[PDB]
Write a protein that binds this ligand. Structure first.
Ligand SMILES: NCc1ccc(-c2ccccc2N2CCNC(=O)C2)cc1
Ligand SMILES: NCc1ccc(-c2ccccc2N2CCNC(=O)C2)cc1
Ligand SMILES: NCc1ccc(-c2ccccc2N2CCNC(=O)C2)cc1
Ligand SMILES: NCc1ccc(-c2ccccc2N2CCNC(=O)C2)cc1
Ligand SMILES: NCc1ccc(-c2ccccc2N2CCNC(=O)C2)cc1
Ligand SMILES: NCc1ccc(-c2ccccc2N2CCNC(=O)C2)cc1
Ligand SMILES: NCc1ccc(-c2ccccc2N2CCNC(=O)C2)cc1
Ligand SMILES: NCc1ccc(-c2ccccc2N2CCNC(=O)C2)cc1
Lengths: 211, 213, 211, 211, 211, 211, 211, 211
């Protein structure tokens, strides 16, 4: 069949190291709602072949794994992608509900942001009057730049807590933001490895730079 | 050839509905009833599509005047869904096929989740409680799995001044497979001369400090 | 399909002089909201087959009828019951809002009521202490009578508007009500032809004796 | 304070013959939900002063009235307008819902209408193709006439029910309507005493000619 | 200061054996949400004086009580009435939210019902042809009886689950129901102590006799 | 092609110059949310065949068009009707939400208005005592004119803000408004193209002439 | 007192060219709802001293003005500020609702926008590759320009509908937008009088350029 | 007045380094929404005295500060505590809504959690079969430990993304949690500085360990 039958021993390889999304069902033979969703999972596995693999771990025969994920009730579904927990769903649900859960979470977000945030690129010490224009000019290589914010943020309530800089770069359209992230993410500049990634456009539009 | 839909009588109701196996949907109807007529082809389709998981029965209230009053039927059509002699749900009036299927699926479903919480009923009298109970429960229930927490809960039954006080003992395990083991090993056993109920308790209520159910 | 198409000429015969409930849709081809509701009327016509006729009047092709009802925008829905305008609704609505609209103005489309109303039976002047008991005893021949309300209602908001009497008789179960309506409707009683008919049970249950 | 405390003997005078809207609450001292709403009624009788009287009948002290209105559970609210039960509401509800309820029923009362209805003006027999134009011309003496509707209404579902005529005249602005009503109300036209009065502008604008 | 300051030792006396509704706040000094609701509770105690007592248990100083109610997070509010837990609220909320919570719960229900249920009055094997008439005759002492229903209900899905009898008696008006319950509740009839109480009118009206 | 694949060069012909409704999807290959809705668009193209054509513009391959519509994130859906922008929906969504969005916006509003507004027709200087009558007379050729308003509106708070004239024309019934708009919209008069369009009837009924 | 008395003759001077906001009450002596708000209006005149002048026009004695505003029923309240109609309110209301209506409408919006739209600046045919760059350069005089949209919009669905150009200029912060609108609104350029005004920021951020 | 008026020059000292919660309003004189909230802010400053400082920055007179927070439209409110941005609110709002916004954000959370997360405490390579047992015994020092989860989380989709360990400790009641967090947070164990903090009880209860 299309379903992967997991054990405690095979979990890391079948799930954590898999290519592609894996939907993990934590189940037991005596569990009413587990038996209810079992036919649905078989239908999911067929329909989403090529995009998702459905796997099941029986928690009676394999008691090692679920506690590591804080599983309480069953069934519980976990969607993994490339080793990350993308989403969790506790209890039974309809095939329609499951599909929307999957569709949404396989997409990863509801919208590609025009806003890029650069992390680990400068220290507060490095902020001068030129930096905004430099960022604008460098990022102008990828598309039209709407606005740049050099934002300083204190990481915790303590007096001695660390101050870091986040550099927001809002492009005119999300294709530009995408090119810039692709060119910049994981690049080394003067001794530091930059994280470039999307920043929630709704937060930014609402002056929330905290994320 | 026998119809899929049972035409109940007053006399057959006991056998055909209350003692039947599997869910039974009962339609109280009459020939002159407009809406009864609206839902008739829908019930025909329901009886086909839900074959194996549902029986559809009809009671004509003009021909069998005895039963409906026992269920406080007023207007017709009125639908009653039975399971194991229990009224699982009721529906007054005509509805769409979509609405009826929604009503059935919701009410046939059974529980959405197996809970980590066991409740032990009729196990101890409020007079039996002392400082050791919680510890004793924890040790006994430890044999089925890791016990997170135990609550010794006293509940007054009614507002009247002399209402009975009962005890519910809640045992939350780390994971539902443990809870299942405890319930299965404990439910229905006689301890110190009383028959104990051991069953799931709704996890969401418990998590929200609602110990009323 | 099951929806009826009207004309200015056919309107009197198909709607006004007709038996039963007719829901009339005033519409046109070019009307965006008329189009939106069209499939919803299709489903209603299906579900309510035998208890409601869904009829459509195109106001371009048939210009004479809508103005007599003071129709302004389209779609406008008019619910007729034996030449009586029962209710009106202007503008597009969902399937559920239309159901709610019919539920509240039809009653007989959901269920046969336990309540019977007797209209044109007695004049206010005739009401005495014995009337409740006499109605109870009379109606007791068709089955168990729960309650009788001798209800007085002022027709219109002018100081000397006429007062009418509706006699409500709630029976134990709708089979009894049916029997009473068949026996009593159209009977002569001291000079007047009695009108006996079902009264919306939900309205009655909520102490609304006004319809 | 503002609230009328009704009795059985005072009910008719205080409720059915009052000017404007009356909210009647049937209650009793032992009734928890009645106590729940007591504060809310207190406030409502304040905030709606000039547009609604709030009235209470204790069903224990005054057991006479409630059965005449098919009152069952308490609290029950009845909204009367000029002696007609306009709407009802059973059971406790928030300040919010009560406001929604009153607003749905009293909105036309907040304004002087541009719409006059003429009542008892013509027989259905008298309706010919000239009447609309003739109304338009006569009423043009009082101001700009937007529209005239010669509306026929059947009084009951019984086949031989009476049909009456209401003539709607919408003027451009409410001062014109007032002049017409002033000049026409209570007058004699071809031997009938005409009722000329404001008609709810919201109903008319929504094709509801039933009031 | 209308607020009762609880300890572990005073809890039973002050709360479980109190007269009237008691709202218990389980709280701590360091707790952010607890501090937020503190002035809200102060105003509630003032506004609701004579219908509610507000009482506070600090779970640091008095660690014995909260675990007996399965308290987890704070603040948690428990509303007590005659030693019964009527409702629970976990976490902070606005004053308006709390007032809604109290209003709903201080009223036992949204409506005083016309329907009485008599529990523990007869075993199934005692039901005969005469019971309905006999209940009707007896209950008629308290007001007009609309309908009586002898309902038999299986207690559980099991094979030899108990079957009990509930006798529903619907009065014409809620004041009659109230008198009946007052007189009948706790009375002894041939060997058993009867429970008489209100039964949700809306459920009854909808043929839901399960509660 | 039930689904049209757009280019910057074909956009005008395929979208702006098309008959009926076009849903434009602005998308890119790397975009997870865009990929999520691709199957849901496939269903839409099916279910709304004849009502709606789905069209897709890839913003990488065709960078010209999206900036002219203020497109930011992707996916973004723009509904066109006869080259008119009807509405916009930003981000992925369920099939249910998309169907909700389409039905309302295909319809355009809840109801076709009886009110037309004429824009760009006269300057405030041109207004004389004759204008109302002349409008009335011209518009009388399309049906019965209920009322004409000559409305002057200042375009902002600034001292030098333009004053414009909106001519409102309320017809007796929506079919007359549609004739007028179809006859007048886009005609040349005194050297300017007229704008004739529907105006929200609820706004108009409520003396809101600001739209 | 503080309430000013309007006539047709003084309306333009007293209302349209006033400094500071004016609430105009269109009223008459026989209007019951008018008399109802009259105390409310005196208290408002008192409370809003220096922020608002209250003003009354009796439509009997001053029949010319109210038709210019599409007044129908009375009372109708219009709020004017700097010769624009800020808001309209039909019918009587509480002092509480009126304060709410005034506070929101005196403010004129919930937020001052960063977006300016320029209307009547260019026609489709004048659009070229230079325009965006030109608008950016001129507007950069007022502050940092984030983005410019050259947007084309067809005025209705008909075949001959006019296509107009709206130029959106999004600034970095609302103080810039304000400078720009004050400079540009009502200026003459190439023989056309331009409108410069705020555009709803939420709409713009959601790619809705339709308003 | 208790309102503090800020300058660019004074901002860091008076806001980022202030004691207690500071509410900053970015405003301007010409801004209608800012004037609307001005009197509400006055009431807030008085009501929350000792608990909140309300401050204002005029963006025309102090143009430096707002762009550093990505301020766009005005008014915008930022709430600061200990140099952290606790919350933001764009646009005008009622006194009611601001009080709700402030109460919630001053509280910090709706409820004190039973669940503690220990972050940066161990490396994935340190994990073994004894670690859960050792955490349990240590944390047993503060109170009754319900459950311990050793959670390994991969930080990114990248094949070499870092793997971190979060240790969850759920106690029986929130006061135990509090003790453990206060004793553990910011301590150094084995040369790494540990974060011990509350973890959202609802997320934990639903097996979501992602935060
Ligand atoms: N965790 C990141 C993430 C964020 C958004 C989506 C998402 C994608 C497509 C359609 C809906 C979506 N959502 C998700 C939940 N909440 C919503 O309201 C809508 C998916 C993952
Ligand atoms: N003077 C400080 C400074 C800081 C950051 C940037 C910059 C910002 C965004 C994207 C690329 C950037 N560059 C690319 C070239 N070389 C670099 O070091 C970084 C530039 C200058
Ligand atoms: N406990 C002292 C403290 C120290 C720093 C901040 C602070 C927080 C956020 C962003 C900037 C900050 N600063 C402050 C001044 N000097 C700067 O240049 C940076 C707040 C309090
Ligand atoms: N004549 C014998 C008799 C049989 C059934 C009932 C009865 C009444 C009400 C509800 C359930 C009922 N049963 C109990 C038995 N087993 C069932 O499953 C159903 C009562 C008497
Ligand atoms: N202190 C009295 C007491 C009360 C309840 C339990 C108990 C709780 C949970 C599960 C099993 C239990 N036992 C098993 C052994 N014998 C028993 O009597 C019951 C134990 C001791
Ligand atoms: N024809 C090309 C063109 C179109 C628009 C603008 C323009 C845009 C925004 C604000 C001011 C503007 N200007 C001010 C100076 N002179 C002007 O005529 C208009 C400029 C050039
Ligand atoms: N972000 C942390 C945080 C979380 C909850 C509260 C909070 C406190 C008290 C009353 C309500 C509250 N809320 C906040 C909004 N949404 C809600 O669901 C309830 C405050 C801050
Ligand atoms: N790898 C072994 C280990 C890892 C973590 C804990 C630990 C967990 C929770 C709270 C404190 C802890 N400690 C550790 C150091 N010494 C202490 O006194 C307390 C204990 C052992």
């Amino acid at each position: 069949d299309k379903i992967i039958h997991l054990t405690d021993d095979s979990f890391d390889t079948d799930v954590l190291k898999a290519d592609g999304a894996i939907l993990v069902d934590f189940w037991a033979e005596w569990c009413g709602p587990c038996k209810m969703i079992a036919p649905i999972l078989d239908e999911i596995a067929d329909e989403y072949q090529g995009k998702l693999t459905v796997a099941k771990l029986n928690i009676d025969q394999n008691p090692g794994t679920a506690p590591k994920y804080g599983i309480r009730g069953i069934p519980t579904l976990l969607l993994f992608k490339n080793g990350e927990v993308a989403a969790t769903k506790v209890g039974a649900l309809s095939k329609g509900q499951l599909k929307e859960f999957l569709d949404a979470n396989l997409a990863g977000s509801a919208m590609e942001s025009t806003v890029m945030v650069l992390r680990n690129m400068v220290d507060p010490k490095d902020i001068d009057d030129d930096l905004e224009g430099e960022v604008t000019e460098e990022c102008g290589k990828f598309g039209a730049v709407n606005r740049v914010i050099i934002y300083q943020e204190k990481q915790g309530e303590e007096e001695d807590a660390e101050i870091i800089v986040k550099i927001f770069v809002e492009f005119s359209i999300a294709s530009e933001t995408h090119k810039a992230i692709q060119a910049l993410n994981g690049r080394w500049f003067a001794g530091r490895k930059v994280v470039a990634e999307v920043y929630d456009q709704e937060r930014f539009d609402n002056s929330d730079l905290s994320a």
